[PDB]
Motif scaffolding. Structure first.
Motif, PDB file in Angstrom:
ATOM      1  N   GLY B  74       0.803  -1.203   0.000  1.00 13.65           N
ATOM      2  CA  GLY B  74       0.000   0.000   0.000  1.00 13.65           C
ATOM      3  C   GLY B  74       0.845   1.265   0.000  1.00 13.65           C
ATOM      4  N   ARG B  75       0.244   2.331   0.507  1.00 15.35           N
ATOM      5  CA  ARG B  75       0.846   3.653   0.556  1.00 15.35           C
ATOM      6  C   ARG B  75       0.676   4.242   1.946  1.00 15.35           C
ATOM      7  NH1 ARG B  75      -3.804   4.215  -2.599  1.00 15.35           N
ATOM      8  NH2 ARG B  75      -5.460   5.449  -1.611  1.00 15.35           N
ATOM      9  N   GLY B 100     -11.694   3.824   1.103  1.00 20.20           N
ATOM     10  CA  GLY B 100     -12.536   3.095   0.183  1.00 20.20           C
ATOM     11  C   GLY B 100     -11.814   2.439  -0.971  1.00 20.20           C
ATOM     12  N   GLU B 101     -10.512   2.664  -1.113  1.00 19.33           N
ATOM     13  CA  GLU B 101      -9.725   2.071  -2.184  1.00 19.33           C
ATOM     14  C   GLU B 101      -8.891   0.930  -1.625  1.00 19.33           C
ATOM     15  OE1 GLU B 101     -10.075   2.842  -5.306  1.00 19.33           O
ATOM     16  OE2 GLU B 101     -11.429   4.530  -4.941  1.00 19.33           O
ATOM     17  N   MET B 104      -2.937  -2.480  -2.351  1.00 19.73           N
ATOM     18  CA  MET B 104      -2.318  -3.569  -3.085  1.00 19.73           C
ATOM     19  C   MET B 104      -0.818  -3.577  -2.832  1.00 19.73           C
ATOM     20  SD  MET B 104      -4.571  -2.571  -6.310  1.00 19.73           S
ATOM     21  CE  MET B 104      -3.321  -2.964  -7.526  1.00 19.73           C
ATOM     22  N   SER B 107       2.369  -5.984  -6.704  1.00 19.56           N
ATOM     23  CA  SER B 107       1.887  -6.990  -7.647  1.00 19.56           C
ATOM     24  C   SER B 107       0.378  -6.799  -7.770  1.00 19.56           C
ATOM     25  CB  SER B 107       2.256  -8.406  -7.199  1.00 19.56           C
ATOM     26  OG  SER B 107       1.727  -8.691  -5.916  1.00 19.56           O
ATOM     27  N   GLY B 108      -0.284  -7.739  -8.433  1.00 21.20           N
ATOM     28  CA  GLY B 108      -1.724  -7.695  -8.562  1.00 21.20           C
ATOM     29  C   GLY B 108      -2.494  -8.216  -7.374  1.00 21.20           C
ATOM     30  N   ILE B 150     -19.024   1.980   0.368  1.00 22.05           N
ATOM     31  CA  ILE B 150     -18.209   2.108  -0.836  1.00 22.05           C
ATOM     32  C   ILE B 150     -17.462   0.810  -1.120  1.00 22.05           C
ATOM     33  CG2 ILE B 150     -16.290   3.351  -1.879  1.00 22.05           C
ATOM     34  CD1 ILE B 150     -17.181   5.826  -0.382  1.00 22.05           C
ATOM     35  N   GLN B 154     -21.089  -4.528  -0.374  1.00 21.64           N
ATOM     36  CA  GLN B 154     -21.510  -5.376  -1.482  1.00 21.64           C
ATOM     37  C   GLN B 154     -20.710  -6.667  -1.562  1.00 21.64           C
ATOM     38  OE1 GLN B 154     -24.200  -4.383  -2.840  1.00 21.64           O
ATOM     39  NE2 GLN B 154     -24.168  -2.300  -2.007  1.00 21.64           N
TER      40      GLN B 154
ATOM     41  N   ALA D  79     -17.129   5.151  -6.270  1.00 24.38           N
ATOM     42  CA  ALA D  79     -17.594   5.595  -4.960  1.00 24.38           C
ATOM     43  C   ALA D  79     -18.832   6.473  -5.082  1.00 24.38           C
ATOM     44  CB  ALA D  79     -16.476   6.340  -4.233  1.00 24.38           C
ATOM     45  N   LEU D  82     -21.907   4.311  -6.042  1.00 27.51           N
ATOM     46  CA  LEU D  82     -22.430   3.539  -4.921  1.00 27.51           C
ATOM     47  C   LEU D  82     -23.078   4.444  -3.881  1.00 27.51           C
ATOM     48  CD1 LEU D  82     -19.630   0.868  -4.508  1.00 27.51           C
ATOM     49  CD2 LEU D  82     -21.915   0.578  -5.456  1.00 27.51           C
ATOM     50  N   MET D 125      -1.043  -5.821 -16.208  1.00 25.32           N
ATOM     51  CA  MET D 125      -0.794  -5.581 -14.795  1.00 25.32           C
ATOM     52  C   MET D 125      -0.622  -4.110 -14.465  1.00 25.32           C
ATOM     53  SD  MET D 125      -0.554  -7.095 -11.878  1.00 25.32           S
ATOM     54  CE  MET D 125      -0.343  -8.787 -12.426  1.00 25.32           C
ATOM     55  N   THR D 129      -2.549  -1.659 -11.785  1.00 27.06           N
ATOM     56  CA  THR D 129      -1.734  -1.124 -10.703  1.00 27.06           C
ATOM     57  C   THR D 129      -1.290   0.312 -10.939  1.00 27.06           C
ATOM     58  OG1 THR D 129       0.299  -2.020 -11.669  1.00 27.06           O
ATOM     59  CG2 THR D 129      -0.916  -3.428 -10.142  1.00 27.06           C
ATOM     60  N   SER D 132      -2.360   2.612  -8.088  1.00 31.35           N
ATOM     61  CA  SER D 132      -1.493   2.454  -6.925  1.00 31.35           C
ATOM     62  C   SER D 132      -0.182   3.206  -7.114  1.00 31.35           C
ATOM     63  CB  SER D 132      -1.232   0.971  -6.663  1.00 31.35           C
ATOM     64  OG  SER D 132      -0.407   0.791  -5.526  1.00 31.35           O
ATOM     65  N   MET D 136       1.427   7.064  -5.436  1.00 27.46           N
ATOM     66  CA  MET D 136       2.765   6.987  -4.850  1.00 27.46           C
ATOM     67  C   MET D 136       2.788   5.993  -3.683  1.00 27.46           C
ATOM     68  SD  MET D 136       5.808   7.763  -5.324  1.00 27.46           S
ATOM     69  CE  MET D 136       5.426   8.855  -6.692  1.00 27.46           C
ATOM     70  N   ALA D 137       2.524   4.738  -4.035  1.00 29.77           N
ATOM     71  CA  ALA D 137       2.523   3.653  -3.061  1.00 29.77           C
ATOM     72  C   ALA D 137       3.930   3.378  -2.541  1.00 29.77           C
ATOM     73  CB  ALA D 137       1.927   2.394  -3.670  1.00 29.77           C
ATOM     74  N   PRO D 159     -19.898  -4.369  -7.928  1.00 24.63           N
ATOM     75  CA  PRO D 159     -20.659  -3.712  -6.850  1.00 24.63           C
ATOM     76  C   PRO D 159     -21.788  -2.831  -7.354  1.00 24.63           C
ATOM     77  CG  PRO D 159     -18.329  -3.624  -6.379  1.00 24.63           C
ATOM     78  CD  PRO D 159     -18.450  -4.133  -7.779  1.00 24.63           C
ATOM     79  N   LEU D 162     -24.628  -5.286  -7.986  1.00 26.24           N
ATOM     80  CA  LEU D 162     -25.170  -5.767  -6.720  1.00 26.24           C
ATOM     81  C   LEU D 162     -25.931  -4.675  -5.984  1.00 26.24           C
ATOM     82  CD1 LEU D 162     -22.144  -7.891  -5.459  1.00 26.24           C
ATOM     83  CD2 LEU D 162     -24.289  -8.732  -6.408  1.00 26.24           C
TER      84      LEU D 162
END
Ligand SMILES: [Ca+2]
Ligand SMILES: [Ca+2]
Ligand SMILES: [Ca+2]
Ligand SMILES: [Ca+2]
Lengths: 97, 194, 149, 176
Positions: B74-75, B100-101, B104, B107-108, B150, B154, D79, D82, D125, D129, D132, D136-137, D159, D162
């Motif tokens: 993550g960040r 809400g995000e 990761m 990688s995926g 968010i 679900q 967001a 939803l 990929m 990504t 992310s 700036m992960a 979502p 759903l």
């Protein structure tokens, strides 16, 4: 005679021909005749016996069909291997193995 | 001192979950060293979260996930960011979301941890460093959650305290030294009765 | 066995090589006979190592090398060249074209030659199992680690 | 991809919905041709099986020219959809859902998509990504069904679908 046969390329190129000629049977019968006489007190002509046994060991290693052919005389070799301990080198027990 | 640095907050052991999908939020009022995640009931109060196998936490100070060590994930968060900790005991996965995000790894991988054994179970847990302030929302009031709809509603996740009258009792690591019996299986100290 | 390892041509070639060593023709290789051919090739060994290189293959211990022992030496030399490379030929059977990947069509070609038949759909089932990269082709590295296609 | 982060909600109705709808009907048209071939088995079906493979290959190219832009747009607007239900967002879910159903049913669709990714060296990929990295992960690096954009877009739009169904409809969903 055994040395000349084992020095001949045909003996290795055509194992089936050697099997058809009954070469292994003839060598085996000569060996057991020597082993048959004096089967308990003393084995004479030891060099001939170890030459025939060494010949049969190389005969088995040429092909599996030759090895199977000698396997049919496994019981015949074992009953003559009781006194083969006296001779050193190549013995009928080695041929069975 | 070494011990008055991290204060660990966790739910009571009676709230241990061994099945289902659960969700709760942690708001980072400050941006310093804070960790949040899921811990086993046998969690030790004097060990940093994630330094052993008893906790699966996310360190938002520099974007790391901790379980038997640290690895990037993550960040880093900011002031007011809400971290949504999600555990799925049907798929044996733990998911962390930031505002809400879904976070990761490099990688995926959409899940922070995988193939986690249920065993005794899991409890929501958080740790705060020196001068750190954080808000823990276990979801007793579903309307109070800011990102559950968010991401998490679900997917089949439920708030950790969706149907509970009293607020969930929490236990904290009190940095007051106390005398306790020497454990019979202590790695370094042995007491023999002669 | 010698028949498995050696062909008729190879036995003939080895006999000519044996006769090259045995200038006398008695059927045995002595130290001087072995030493003579080494000098023709440039080497000048001593009798200490010359006896050792005879005893290393002399089976009956008579001190001389005959044709049965000479063939047994060459039979081992042909056999021990291949130790674990048998998977390389197996890979090339599936790899008709000659590159480093096994294609589905190539897998069809070998499966067509074999008794079992595929309905042109389960061929994708085992190739994706063997191919971890997901590029649709099984390379040599993927084949050795796990063999299904 | 970098410029989609500032896209306005009007692009969902003005641009994205008409474009995906064209792709959706194109996908339905090709699979209609594919099922026509199989119902009448013939030695000539091979001469024409290549035609639908070409039609699937060009179709997969068009999907991969729009889905990476769509995926990023969905992430920055899911967001809001939803939080406040949107008719256009629900319509987009049906379009991506039907394309996924076509992809799942058709055998050639999966094959052509896999061929397109590997032959064009599509990362598949970075498309998932980039956000992310913007903030700036090994196993299936060349291609994987999990990282396929056809199924990745649906899971991000799931979502939204759903959200239409009421909680009382869970029993009906299981029956269906
Ligand atoms: Ca000589
Ligand atoms: Ca000798
Ligand atoms: Ca190939
Ligand atoms: Ca591959």
């Amino acid at each position: 005679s055994i040395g000349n046969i084992m020095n001949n390329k045909v003996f290795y190129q055509h194992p089936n021909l050697m099997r058809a000629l009954g070469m292994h049977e003839t060598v085996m019968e000569v060996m057991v005749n020597v082993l048959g006489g004096g089967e308990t007190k003393e084995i004479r002509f030891p060099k001939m016996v170890t030459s025939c046994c060494r010949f049969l060991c190389y005969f088995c290693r040429i092909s599996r069909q030759n090895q199977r052919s000698m396997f049919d005389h496994l019981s015949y070799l074992l009953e003559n291997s009781g006194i083969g301990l006296g001779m050193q080198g190549s013995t009928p027990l080695d041929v069975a193995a | 001192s070494r011990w008055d640095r991290v204060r660990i907050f966790r739910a009571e052991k009676s709230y241990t979950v061994q099945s289902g999908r659960w969700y709760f939020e942690f708001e980072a009022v400050t941006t310093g060293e804070m960790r949040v995640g899921w811990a086993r009931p046998e969690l030790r109060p004097d060990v940093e979260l994630g330094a052993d196998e008893l906790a699966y936490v996310f360190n938002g100070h520099r974007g790391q996930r901790w379980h038997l060590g640290s690895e990037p994930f993550g960040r880093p968060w900011q002031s007011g960011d809400v971290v949504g900790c999600m555990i799925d005991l049907t798929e044996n996965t733990i998911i962390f979301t930031l505002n809400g995000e879904v976070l990761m790894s490099d990688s995926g991988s959409e899940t922070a941890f995988r193939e986690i054994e249920i065993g005794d179970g899991f409890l929501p847990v958080c740790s705060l460093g020196p001068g750190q302030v954080g808000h823990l929302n276990l979801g007793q009031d579903v309307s109070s959650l800011r990102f559950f709809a968010i991401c998490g509603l679900q997917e089949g996740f439920e708030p950790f305290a969706i149907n509970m009258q009293r607020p969930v009792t929490t236990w904290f690591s009190k940095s007051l030294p106390q005398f306790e019996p020497v454990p019979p299986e202590h790695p370094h100290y042995e007491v023999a009765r002669m | 066995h010698m028949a498995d390892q050696l062909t008729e041509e190879q036995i003939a070639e080895f006999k000519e090589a044996f006769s090259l060593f045995d200038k006398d023709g008695d059927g045995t290789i002595t130290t001087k006979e072995l030493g003579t051919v080494m000098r023709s090739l440039g080497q000048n060994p001593t009798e200490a190592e010359l006896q050792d290189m005879i005893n290393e293959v002399d089976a009956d211990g008579n001190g001389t090398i005959d044709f049965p022992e000479f063939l047994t030496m060459m039979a081992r030399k042909m056999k021990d060249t291949d130790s674990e490379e048998e998977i390389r030929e197996a890979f090339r059977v599936f790899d008709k074209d000659g590159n480093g990947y096994i294609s589905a069509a190539e897998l069809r070609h070998v499966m067509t030659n074999l008794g079992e038949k595929l309905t042109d759909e389960e061929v994708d089932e085992m190739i994706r199992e063997a191919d971890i990269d997901g590029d649709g082709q099984v390379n040599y590295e993927e084949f050795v680690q796990m063999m299904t296609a | 991809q970098p410029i989609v982060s500032r896209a306005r909600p009007e692009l969902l109705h003005s641009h994205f919905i008409p474009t995906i709808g064209r792709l959706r009907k194109r996908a339905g048209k090709v699979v209609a041709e594919e099922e026509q071939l199989r119902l009448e088995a013939k030695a000539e079906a091979e001469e024409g099986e290549l035609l639908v493979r070409d039609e699937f290959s060009v179709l997969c190219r068009d999907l991969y020219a729009l889905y990476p832009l769509l995926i990023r747009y969905v992430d920055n607007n899911r967001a809001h959809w939803l939080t406040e239900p949107n008719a256009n967002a629900e319509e987009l879910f049906r379009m991506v859902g039907e394309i996924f159903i076509y992809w799942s049913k058709s055998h050639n669709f999966k094959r052509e998509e896999q061929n397109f990714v590997v032959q064009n060296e599509i990362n598949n990929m970075s498309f998932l990504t980039a956000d992310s990295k913007s903030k700036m992960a090994r196993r299936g690096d060349r291609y994987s069904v999990q990282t396929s954009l056809i199924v990745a877009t649906l899971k991000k739009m799931l979502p939204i679908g759903l959200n239409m169904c009421a909680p009382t409809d869970q029993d009906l969903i299981m029956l269906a």
